[PDB]
Amino acid sequence: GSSNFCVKNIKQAEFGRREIEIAEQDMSALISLRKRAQGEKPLAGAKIVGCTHITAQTAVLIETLCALGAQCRWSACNIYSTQNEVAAALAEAGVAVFAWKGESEDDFWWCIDRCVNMQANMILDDGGDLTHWVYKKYPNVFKKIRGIVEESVTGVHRLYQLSKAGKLCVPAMNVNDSVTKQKFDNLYCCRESILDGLKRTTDVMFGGKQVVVCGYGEVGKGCCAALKALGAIVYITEIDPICALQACMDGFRVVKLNEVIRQVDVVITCTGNKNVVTREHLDRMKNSCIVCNMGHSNTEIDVTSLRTPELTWERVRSQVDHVIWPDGKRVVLLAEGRLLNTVPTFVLSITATTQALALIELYNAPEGRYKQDVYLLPKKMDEYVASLHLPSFDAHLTELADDQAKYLGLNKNGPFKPNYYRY
Amino acid sequence: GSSNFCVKNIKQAEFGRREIEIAEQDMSALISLRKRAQGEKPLAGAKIVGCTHITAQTAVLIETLCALGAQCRWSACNIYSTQNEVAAALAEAGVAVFAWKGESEDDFWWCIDRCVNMDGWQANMILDDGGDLTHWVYKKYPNVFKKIRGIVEESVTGVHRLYQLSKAGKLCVPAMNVNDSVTKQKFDNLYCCRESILDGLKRTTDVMFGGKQVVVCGYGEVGKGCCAALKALGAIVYITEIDPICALQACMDGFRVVKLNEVIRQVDVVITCTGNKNVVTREHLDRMKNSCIVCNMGHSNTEIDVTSLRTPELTWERVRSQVDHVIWPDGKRVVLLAEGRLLNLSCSTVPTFVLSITATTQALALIELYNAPEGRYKQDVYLLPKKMDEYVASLHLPSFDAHLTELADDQAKYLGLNKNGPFKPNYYRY
Amino acid sequence: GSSNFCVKNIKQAEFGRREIEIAEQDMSALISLRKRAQGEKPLAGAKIVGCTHITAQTAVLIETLCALGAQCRWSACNIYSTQNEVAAALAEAGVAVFAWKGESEDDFWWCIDRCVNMDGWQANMILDDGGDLTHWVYKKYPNVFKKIRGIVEESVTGVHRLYQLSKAGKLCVPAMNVNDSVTKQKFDNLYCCRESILDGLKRTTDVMFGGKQVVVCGYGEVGKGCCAALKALGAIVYITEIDPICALQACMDGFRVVKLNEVIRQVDVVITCTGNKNVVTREHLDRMKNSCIVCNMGHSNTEIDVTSLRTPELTWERVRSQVDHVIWPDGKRVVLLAEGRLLNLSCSTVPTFVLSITATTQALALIELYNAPEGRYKQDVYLLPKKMDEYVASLHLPSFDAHLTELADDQAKYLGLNKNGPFKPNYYRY
Amino acid sequence: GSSNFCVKNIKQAEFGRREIEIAEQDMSALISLRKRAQGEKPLAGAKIVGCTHITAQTAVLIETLCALGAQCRWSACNIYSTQNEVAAALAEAGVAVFAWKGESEDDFWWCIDRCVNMQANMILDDGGDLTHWVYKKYPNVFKKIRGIVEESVTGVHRLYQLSKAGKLCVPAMNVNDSVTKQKFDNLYCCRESILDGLKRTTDVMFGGKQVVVCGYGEVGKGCCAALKALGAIVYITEIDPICALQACMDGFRVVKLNEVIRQVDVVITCTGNKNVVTREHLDRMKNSCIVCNMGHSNTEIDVTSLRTPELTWERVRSQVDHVIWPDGKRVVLLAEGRLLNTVPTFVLSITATTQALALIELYNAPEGRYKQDVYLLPKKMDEYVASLHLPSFDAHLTELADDQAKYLGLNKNGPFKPNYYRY
Numbered sequence A, D: 001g002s003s004n005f006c007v008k009n010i011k012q013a014e015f016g017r018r019e020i021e022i023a024e025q026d027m028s029a030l031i032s033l034r035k036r037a038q039g040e041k042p043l044a045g046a047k048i049v050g051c052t053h054i055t056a057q058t059a060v061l062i063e064t065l066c067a068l069g070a071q072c073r074w075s076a077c078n079i080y081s082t083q084n085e086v087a088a089a090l091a092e093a094g095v096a097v098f099a100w101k102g103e104s105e106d107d108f109w110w111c112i113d114r115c116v117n118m119q120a121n122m123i124l125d126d127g128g129d130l131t132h133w134v135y136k137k138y139p140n141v142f143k144k145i146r147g148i149v150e151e152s153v154t155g156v157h158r159l160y161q162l163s164k165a166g167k168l169c170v171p172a173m174n175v176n177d178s179v180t181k182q183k184f185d186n187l188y189c190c191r192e193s194i195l196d197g198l199k200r201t202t203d204v205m206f207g208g209k210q211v212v213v214c215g216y217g218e219v220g221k222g223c224c225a226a227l228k229a230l231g232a233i234v235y236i237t238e239i240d241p242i243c244a245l246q247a248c249m250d251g252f253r254v255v256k257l258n259e260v261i262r263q264v265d266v267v268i269t270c271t272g273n274k275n276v277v278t279r280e281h282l283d284r285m286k287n288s289c290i291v292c293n294m295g296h297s298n299t300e301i302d303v304t305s306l307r308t309p310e311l312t313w314e315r316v317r318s319q320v321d322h323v324i325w326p327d328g329k330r331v332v333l334l335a336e337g338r339l340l341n342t343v344p345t346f347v348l349s350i351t352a353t354t355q356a357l358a359l360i361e362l363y364n365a366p367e368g369r370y371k372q373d374v375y376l377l378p379k380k381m382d383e384y385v386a387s388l389h390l391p392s393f394d395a396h397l398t399e400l401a402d403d404q405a406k407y408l409g410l411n412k413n414g415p416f417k418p419n420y421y422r423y
Numbered sequence B, C: 001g002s003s004n005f006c007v008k009n010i011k012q013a014e015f016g017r018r019e020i021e022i023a024e025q026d027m028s029a030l031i032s033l034r035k036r037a038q039g040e041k042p043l044a045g046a047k048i049v050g051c052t053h054i055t056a057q058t059a060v061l062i063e064t065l066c067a068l069g070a071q072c073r074w075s076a077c078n079i080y081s082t083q084n085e086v087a088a089a090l091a092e093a094g095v096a097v098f099a100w101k102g103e104s105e106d107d108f109w110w111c112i113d114r115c116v117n118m119d120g121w122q123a124n125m126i127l128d129d130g131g132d133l134t135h136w137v138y139k140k141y142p143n144v145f146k147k148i149r150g151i152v153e154e155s156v157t158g159v160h161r162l163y164q165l166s167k168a169g170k171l172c173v174p175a176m177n178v179n180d181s182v183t184k185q186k187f188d189n190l191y192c193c194r195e196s197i198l199d200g201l202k203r204t205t206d207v208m209f210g211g212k213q214v215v216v217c218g219y220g221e222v223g224k225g226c227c228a229a230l231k232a233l234g235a236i237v238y239i240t241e242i243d244p245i246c247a248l249q250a251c252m253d254g255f256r257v258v259k260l261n262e263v264i265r266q267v268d269v270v271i272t273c274t275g276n277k278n279v280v281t282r283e284h285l286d287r288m289k290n291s292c293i294v295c296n297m298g299h300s301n302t303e304i305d306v307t308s309l310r311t312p313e314l315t316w317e318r319v320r321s322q323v324d325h326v327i328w329p330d331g332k333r334v335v336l337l338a339e340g341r342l343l344n345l346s347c348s349t350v351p352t353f354v355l356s357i358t359a360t361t362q363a364l365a366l367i368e369l370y371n372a373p374e375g376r377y378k379q380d381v382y383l384l385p386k387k388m389d390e391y392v393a394s395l396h397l398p399s400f401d402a403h404l405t406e407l408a409d410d411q412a413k414y415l416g417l418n419k420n421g422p423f424k425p426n427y428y429r430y
């Protein structure tokens, strides 16, 4: 007699778990953590309020969190990402899931509500919308929270905003910038997928072409290397002298966007800033110049300055518009300045383990370890995330000998690197 | 008319000054740091006791410190490294330099001590490269040691010595780890792990690595550089690790993580870059196939238990410089490079650009700790501030004619950042 | 007033001409070849029968031929590829074009035949892309076929068809293999094997290859490109080969050469790029581990015996476009892409620069064979002359603003070479 | 009672063969060819006159050639390269070896003599000095020769000179440009070793530096890729439009040497030409610019124009001179314009097998297969060279199935590629 949930369940729980069964086969790292951490119950009594994508992979995390003794009350962090069939499966398992595909902005806040009120220990968030809603609607529930586990870039920025500015009164965990997760998201975004959206939408070869990549951070470094590999001539713009010196040494020219704006075939933004590519820059670009945002939002390129009456827009294909100037000049604008963009199950597994361990760490943390500030996942916990993914490669880790562990000032299991280690 | 110096240099100043003049054209980033902060004398009142190599490059650092108001008393960190000519030009310039080429072990500790004690001289700062001068001030003059405003250390073992006193509470003075400061760290990594990583190995071997099987022990800065270099030449690289993060990094970089024994009998090359002792033991050396190459790109000479190969049944043949063939009674030989030591310690010298990065880091690390308020640094080892790291990088940008973009008021408002202030958070790995 | 054309285009010429005008800015190398050889009309008297895609790029080639004095009669090599608008502008320009989008198999052979026979028209040259027009002239009009001055073929199967007649003595006319001409070959290799090699695979899969085990069957142009691309992402790549040179190349590039069976049960991805039949047989598909990906980057759809997977005990589920999950009775599924066909044939189009290289090669291959003296080419298939290959490359250099160095009389005397003549020997692989 | 030889043998034959025994262990590809081709005796009666380096590796080829039924009369192609101890070992084995270290230019031609006259079938050469000596001293012995097997660049050029110009009246084998050998020499020279001499002698890092590589052939492509990998900014000069287009597409600028001569930190020649870097170029180079020849001879850079009285030479280290101009400007000249430069035993094994099979092919060739021209080693013979080196990697070659070999128009063992194949 299941009541505590809100999904559009049509006996979908039988099919829903069958798609989770496939996901469980693909994320054997969490099932190992489930098996290894079982019995001990490190989340015994934990009342977790979650807000993330309701997918078959996520179910493996929620069903793992609940298997380690936690009370799961959940919501969807997006109004279209909910895999209703898996959501309906979670409802039958006992998980208080309030989520469906095609929910409105009112249904969205309604689900976050039914998730909070009906003594919530912890909050697992992806976005920070649930965290901010508990910050302006239930502040006495908020001050009693043991820890906020955040995986989103903006959500974590919102937490760093509260901190130091005198507002954060609860210890937080930045899992986005945590070592094992950051490094793995870097490999997927900046190494593997970096030019997939750009190659998919353009049908030109980058060999022998001139490109300008704005920003030489994670995305910029990844982008330039991939473009360099293809035989493209790449130029870089930077505000950070460390990143600029890094570009110089990597055989790239560090320029001001205007020095190359008139000759480059392709313009790429990956800064996280606004008005990097302005009206003046789009006016100086040579005809057919590809304009691409590989950073955030749609403010990196001032696309709003191209809606004026003299310019005309012609839709070439999906996610490709031609913005034509009265002199006949056209720029190939990809996805209206938005990031072109399903995350691989192995990437989610890395994130899910980091999130799971971040909850176990903050929940069982002593009163004096974590102050009212944002923190990264402990080094030994970061090592545990990596270790749980090693059997997927049949990787044989070496154990330190008693004299070896005595030589280097460290424990046979303990943190192997200093705090400032960059990997 | 001054006699406050000890050099062999019998009017070698004129010639030596020309070498500093030549060096100053290559240390253009230090001359800028000199020019930009002079007249404001940020080291006015600093009494610095130094122990580093005396070269025409180092001399530019010593003189930038003297130009920023500091009063220097210098020593050599090595008994062979001293370029006497520059030591003269410095002594003639007024710097209290106490060094020459061809020192004995007793002369080495005489000079170090000459820096520490003098009538009316009390040291503010210690700039070391090795830690030997620091261990000397710590044990010979503990009362002077407690009164030092800050230690700036270059060396790996010297910094680890400083980190050891911390967590043991023997460190009563703040320390600056320049070795792991971003700009300096990233630059050494590029020199050591990217550009030079196979130089020593290629120089001493005369085989091609393409098509070969190599086992690299450790996947840290050196291991990563090494494996990339070997991957690019066509070598099949196997990795051993104790750290599951570094091992997962290797799995994701296309390498298999194995226990040393799983491949020891099939690899053509064995490389150690751990910083550990007995990574390759007698057991491993015995199981290696004939013509296997054994190399240490890590620390000291204890990564491979070379002393276990000094048994009467084994026969040593130096076939080339730094190359020994250790032949077993059954005829099997292992090609052992530099007797288990790092090869680069007996091959070449550090590029002036790498020296420029380091010297700039050192000068700013001394300017920081000296002018630092209390409570900003306690009795611990710290890394160079981000705005200082950025400045080290910025001073080296004109040599590439780099054009840095400056944030607009609207742009710098969007990010919670200063137009010229720190651009990255503390946990930024770059 | 002419009616010598068959197009659907009801005054579509004005619009279509604008597309050729747009294309001519991207085919700048052909406009130069046009401009440089015009007035000298090297194709004056050539009666060319063509069968290629009708696009605004191809139209620039057809018009360069008509501008060099040639008289053209064109057909489409595909029943879907025709851009009708350009077909109008060409018909209006005077070219005898016989093509439109949405042809039936019977319409396709009607147009091909319309090109071949006409009152007072006898073909000098055949420009094909597929070989279907060549097989048609060879069997329907053998008397016209023996009188053709030269065949210039673009396609892989068309060229192999031409190479088959040779050594069998059925080829009575000289043929130009543009597919394996240096400039064209090196350019396709860069597009197909370097730039696009994993595009189809990345588009249809949603997994990361870094850390995965991949077996690539064949280490030719495609296999080499593929393995490099996979090596760079962090994948562990295994190679299978029949050719010991290509296998030794893989051994030297850091890959293990294995028999397909040695790794079939452990690989995450299987790739075929051989050009052979039954490289991956039912036995292999049965031994693949659950979630294995099967991809064909070779020819047709016979490299993987997909027809052996159409048994009643196997269940097919199209999870995405061009992605089928073939599930066994025990639950094990294999992710099979494009039903064993090449993915690129249903994803994108060929870059205009690649088209420019090819079109330039084709025009010069027709200028060569038409103006070629007898005894220079016999009843065999030949590659484009070196000085012509150099010219194809030279015509594309200004788009990069390349500055070619010219040999001095002393320099060109030192090497047995002409200042502008052939620069490399015949066996030069580049 | 050994007489037919000329070495400085002091019972060195006992130690000599012990160094060959080590070499035999390292080139098991030739011992396999020795074993496989034994019994058949494809060189039965062959009277080979050889001129190459007398090393422990070479001994394995000579002792293999003689093991396949050939009569070995040998000389040294260089006056300093002879490993006397191995030469003395060959003398005892029955090989007519006339060679020693430190022989004069008169001793050199004397040894080539005692090698020819005492009915020589074949000639195996490395240089073409022995081939030219049989061309101007014994022309009736020369016209009776079945084939010339040449491995040297200049020696092969000398043969291509005779051919077409109406002088070559004997079929030749170009083993230098033969597929398996060319590709393997390319890997050693242009991939593995390309920057070893330059890195060894300079002590600067190439990251962030500007380089000019003159020529984009085998050496140029190899050099630029290695420099590109290190983060250097590389520019290229070319005379060949195919090679120039190749550079463009590889993300390099194709320039005239003068456009970059004043800004580049490093100048590299790999053209095979003379006066690429002239007096005018060395006068425009910025102070400390490294000048390096990676091509041929010492004529690529006009070093002879820097001996004039206004310039001064200062020897920095071994193979590094500073050429100082009166204005104080200095250029770092490496090895007086000469190539900086022991070849690995696996490379020699590839060459030795190609040479061995080139001799078996031309000796047993029918009268009508090879005319009076220079040829490359047959494709199936090239495949045999590669196959014999595969067990060193434990490489498992796939055998074509009867229907597979029927599908592609080829034999289960025959040439797998067309003649124009570039690999």
Ligand SMILES: NC(=O)c1ccc[n+]([C@@H]2O[C@H](COP(=O)([O-])OP(=O)(O)OC[C@H]3O[C@@H](n4cnc5c(N)ncnc54)[C@H](O)[C@@H]3O)[C@@H](O)[C@H]2O)c1
Pocket: A153, A189, A190, A214, A215, A216, A217, A218, A219, A220, A237, A238, A239, A240, A243, A270, A271, A272, A273, A276, A294, A295, A296, A339, B405, B411, B423
């Ligand atoms: N493309 C993707 O797959 C993807 C994925 C996740 C996030 N992002 C977003 O992309 C942006 C960049 O991500 P990152 O991880 O590379 O960040 P990062 O902080 O590592 O790098 C951003 C870089 O841009 C530089 N920069 C900032 N303003 C600039 C300016 N206006 N002109 C030139 N350079 C400037 C910064 O100094 C920094 O080096 C962020 O907003 C990030 O959230 C992109």
Ligand SMILES: NC(=O)c1ccc[n+]([C@@H]2O[C@H](COP(=O)([O-])OP(=O)(O)OC[C@H]3O[C@@H](n4cnc5c(N)ncnc54)[C@H](O)[C@@H]3O)[C@@H](O)[C@H]2O)c1
Pocket: A398, A404, A416, B156, B192, B193, B217, B218, B219, B220, B221, B222, B223, B240, B241, B242, B243, B246, B273, B274, B275, B276, B279, B297, B298, B299, B342, B344
């Ligand atoms: N080769 C060079 O040019 C060079 C230069 C400077 C310093 N070093 C020295 O080399 C050592 C390594 O340098 P690094 O920069 O790589 O340091 P690092 O800490 O970044 O890397 C050391 C790695 O070795 C691994 N490791 C430790 N014990 C192991 C074991 N026994 N088996 C397998 N792996 C093991 C660790 O997990 C770590 O990742 C240090 O002592 C350093 O001082 C070498």
Ligand SMILES: NC(=O)c1ccc[n+]([C@@H]2O[C@H](COP(=O)([O-])OP(=O)(O)OC[C@H]3O[C@@H](n4cnc5c(N)ncnc54)[C@H](O)[C@@H]3O)[C@@H](O)[C@H]2O)c1
Pocket: C156, C192, C193, C217, C218, C219, C220, C221, C222, C223, C240, C241, C242, C243, C246, C273, C274, C275, C276, C279, C297, C298, C299, C342, C344, D398, D404, D416
């Ligand atoms: N992927 C693409 O974009 C693309 C593009 C054009 C053509 N192709 C086609 O793909 C096929 C291969 O192209 P290529 O350019 O690599 O040709 P290629 O001849 O250069 O390479 C084929 C390789 O496959 C090897 N091989 C043959 N049978 C084998 C076997 N059964 N097992 C293992 N290896 C085997 C051969 O030794 C040869 O090296 C051709 O039919 C070609 O038309 C693919």
Ligand SMILES: NC(=O)c1ccc[n+]([C@@H]2O[C@H](COP(=O)([O-])OP(=O)(O)OC[C@H]3O[C@@H](n4cnc5c(N)ncnc54)[C@H](O)[C@@H]3O)[C@@H](O)[C@H]2O)c1
Pocket: C405, C411, C423, D153, D189, D190, D214, D215, D216, D217, D218, D219, D220, D237, D238, D239, D240, D243, D270, D271, D272, D273, D276, D294, D295, D296, D339
């Ligand atoms: N560095 C080494 O390890 C090494 C080894 C063997 C031989 N070589 C010699 O080096 C030279 C180059 O060898 P390769 O195999 O690269 O030859 P290659 O024929 O493959 O390339 C030479 C290139 O230089 C270009 N070129 C010729 N003259 C030029 C000019 N004056 N200006 C600019 N470019 C010019 C040619 O077009 C050609 O592309 C040859 O003499 C060769 O014998 C060098």
